[PDB]
Amino acid sequence: LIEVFVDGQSVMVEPGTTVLQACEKVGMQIPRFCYHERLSVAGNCRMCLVEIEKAPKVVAACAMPVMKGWNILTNSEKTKKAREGVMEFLLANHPLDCPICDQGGECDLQDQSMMFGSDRSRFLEGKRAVEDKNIGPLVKTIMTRCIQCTRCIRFASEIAGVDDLGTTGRGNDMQVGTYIEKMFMSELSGNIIDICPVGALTXXXXXXXXXXXXXXXXXXXXXXXXXXXXXXXXXXXXXXXXXXXXXXXXXXXXXX
């Protein structure tokens, strides 16, 4: 065990621990896009870029471990310069769907712009649009709304089993789709719509029905299939329509 200070305050952590994983113990959450709960640690966004006490270049929270007793500030001037800047890169090639978009409030990228993103102005000219990907019953996927990350790519190979999603191009023309026209298998791939931060993958049954506002959440155990328990069901006046997986320590691994 080795102690390392985060925002001057010292906190105890393991020898092999991530910077974002250690910051949570000190009650501080950094801006995230690539998960830390169950999905494998990967770069491919550089949003969680934080500056150390003595460093020429900023390091990512997911990649770089603590190792030695070094101070890292979360509310620093160098950390703010990155977070206000990277948001502008994410929205330079964003299709603009916020009213029409299936998510609205639930969207993680929507919230991060209000808290960390640069509000004053946005300079952009001509955003690239991607063709619609083939999907069967659950989760009507829009490739344009996707930010091109690595979250659902690793989810298909590790958590779901059979791989389907991957890289298709090189530049801005690169898509997160299956490339070959084939419907995704059920098993546990229904949780992929709840996995994605942006409004790219969202359930076809709950598409354009209710927003994040007005819908009241209530926790209830699942009746269909044993062992599965704790799932938030949105009321949204009289008849329920949206169902979401609630976090559990041992009952369910962040998937319904």
Partner 1 sequence: RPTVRPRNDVAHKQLSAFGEYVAEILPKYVQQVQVSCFNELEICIHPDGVIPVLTFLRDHSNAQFKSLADLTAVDIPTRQNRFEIVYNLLSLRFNSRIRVKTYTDELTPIESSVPVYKAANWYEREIWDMFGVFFANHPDLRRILTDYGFEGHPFRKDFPLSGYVELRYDDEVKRVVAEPVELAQEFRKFDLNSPWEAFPAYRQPP
Partner 2 sequence: TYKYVNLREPSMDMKSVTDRAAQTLLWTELIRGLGMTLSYLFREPATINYPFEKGPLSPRFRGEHALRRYPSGEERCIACKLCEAVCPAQAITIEAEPRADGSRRTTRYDIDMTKCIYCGFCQEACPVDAIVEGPNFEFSTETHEELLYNKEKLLNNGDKWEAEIAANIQADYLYR
Partner 3 sequence: XXXXXXXXXXXXXXXXXXXXXXXXXXXXXXXXXXXXXXXXXXXXXXXXXXXXXXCDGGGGALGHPRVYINLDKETKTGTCGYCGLQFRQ
CA distances, 230 to each of 223, 244, 253 (Å): 10, 9, 11
Taking the complex as a whole, how short is the minimal distance between the CB of residue 228 and ligand SF4, in angstroms?
A: 23
Taking the complex as a whole, how short is the minimal distance between the CB of residue 35 and ligand SF4, in angstroms?
A: 9
Stretch that binds ligand FES, among 41-49, 109-117, 137-145, 240-248 (CB under 6 A): 41-49
216 scored as a contact of partner 2 (CB under 8 A) = no
Stretch that binds ligand SF4, among 15-23, 66-74, 100-108, 208-216 (CB under 6 A): 100-108
In the block, tokens 């990649």 appear at: 63
Q: Which is nearer to partner 3, 51 or 102 (CB)?
A: 102
Taking the complex as a whole, how short is the minimal distance between the CB of residue 105 and partner 2, in angstroms?
A: 9
Q: Which is nearer to partner 2, 99 or 126 (CB)?
A: 99
DSSP 132-197: PPP--SS-EE-TTT----SHHHHIIIIIISS-------SSTT---S-SS--PPP-TTGGGHHHH-S
Angle between helices 108-115 and 77-90 (to 10 degrees): 140
Token output for 72: 């890292």
Contact 249, 237 (CB under 8 A): no
Annotated binding-site residues for [4Fe-4S] cluster read 94, 98, 101, 107, 146, 149, 152, 196
Chain positions contacting ligand FES, by CB under 6 A: 32-34, 43, 45-48, 60-62
